Subunit: 122 residues, 4 copies
């Protein structure tokens, strides 16, 4: 169950999350950490029964940079895997797609990565 | 609203989906198209108010290759953007992460793409 | 076994390439195609000895977007595979990275895909 | 402005590279580091004239995983940027593509990240 919680990224984002018994992910993303109108609904999925081999626990989740206060006309999906214990992290790769005229399709999707930890950076 | 529906991919996958008035995505992924125990719950997010410039409509969604019948200990997040009209498509990039020993972390995430259309391929 | 030549992608860009007998790839890439002021240097590598089970031929290459007529301050790589036959295609995927101040480092790399064909698109 | 040299990543791999005065990149990459049987050819490009606003230096390169001692039937490219200073790092991202039959074409390309530093990791 050790997914549910708060999770901080190197750069200064934060999201708390729940893991539905069945296998859901519900939460909200805070893209600063001292903000309020800069939170966005979070939903995603994670393998609710993982393997017995020290192997990761696959997950993903999406967040749409639009809320009741702002719209970036964009959305990030985080894909990766959660590891547990004392050094416990959420290792992801992420994609970011904006809405584009088809003229600029080709340049619509930023790629990156993010390591989330259960205790703040610096 | 022209997201809700069925969507087919070049290769032979299918997913029907709803767009919550607010901005959610709920659905289920069929990874063949004539299957049944090979469907997986689908949830994700999409910009419920898009821009007025012919620009795409950003979205993403995640699917965990584990259900009541199978487990691939994996998960795909699809990120991209939906375009409408008579030639209407869901253009995405996708990531796939498996659970890995940390020994094999480095090789945990397949990258690809998928163009979804509202009417079957071949 | 005919990587050597001229190739074209979904949007009418072109790169010519000789395929050194070991893995060398060198040649060029032309933003558009009919123009000498928008031409760019290209080097890369490929498997000079692919398996015989009709498996693709892995390859990669690079086009720092700099010449004597423009500097874009950026570089694309292309990773993927050659699949000869009637319809010879170089199915690839690419990462486009610009040079950023440390703060924009995160929005630095586009991701995308590209099919190349020995015949011009539409 | 010191791309030329020896670099190391989070897992103790290494590549040496000369940075041609225009953009050439050539050199090598060593699966591990202390071994001649696991060494691989490397070519690429970089912006030989990056802007002066302390922006990174874009670059890319390729290592078809083939030598006289092993053939992996695959190729990685590395796209990213050089950021000199006290802590000079080449922050990159990479795509690892194997040669596949048309049916496995979809599970063909790993994606991932890599920091390189002029000093060995741990």
């Amino acid at each position: 169950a050790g997914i549910t919680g708060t999770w901080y990224n190197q750069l200064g984002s934060t999201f708390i999350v729940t893991a539905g018994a069945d296998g859901a992910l519900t939460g909200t993303y805070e893209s600063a950490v001292g903000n309020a109108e800069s939170r966005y609904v979070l939903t995603g999925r994670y393998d609710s029964a993982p393997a017995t081999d020290g192997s990761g626990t696959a997950l993903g989740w999406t967040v749409a940079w639009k809320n009741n206060y702002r719209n970036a006309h964009s959305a990030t999906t985080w894909s990766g895997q959660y590891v547990g214990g004392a050094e416990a992290r959420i290792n992801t790769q992420w994609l970011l797609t904006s809405g584009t005229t088809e003229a600029n399709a080709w340049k619509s999707t930023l790629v990156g990565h993010d390591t989330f930890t259960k205790v703040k950076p610096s």
